[PDB]
Symmetry: none
Subunit: 34 residues, 5 copies
């Protein structure tokens, strides 16, 4: 697994609540949500 | 697995609630949601 | 598996609720939803 | 499997509820929905 | 399998409910829905 993530010139504004990331990379990602 | 994710010039505004990413990459992604 | 995902010039506005990504890539994606 | 996904100039506005992605790519995708 | 998906100049507005993607690509897609 080779991963490249690139972000340029984002404007992010008035984020409420909960914010985990902009980029995620793993061999496995597990989300358990309730 | 080779992954490339590129984002340019996004405006993201007034996000309420929950926000995990803009980009996700893995070998496995599992979401369990209730 | 080779994956390329490119996004340019998005405006995203007044997102309520839950938002996991704009881009997902894996070898396997599993979503279990209730 | 070679996948190319490109998005340009989207306006996304007043999204309620649940939003997983704009782009998905895998070798297998599984959705179990209730 | 070679897949190319391109989207330009979409306006998406007042999406309620649940929204998984605009583009999906796999070698196999399985949706089980109830």
């Amino acid at each position: 697994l080779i991963v490249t993530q690139t972000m340029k010139g984002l404007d992010i504004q008035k984020v409420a609540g909960t914010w985990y990331s902009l980029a995620m990379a793993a061999s496995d990602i597990s989300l358990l949500d309730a």
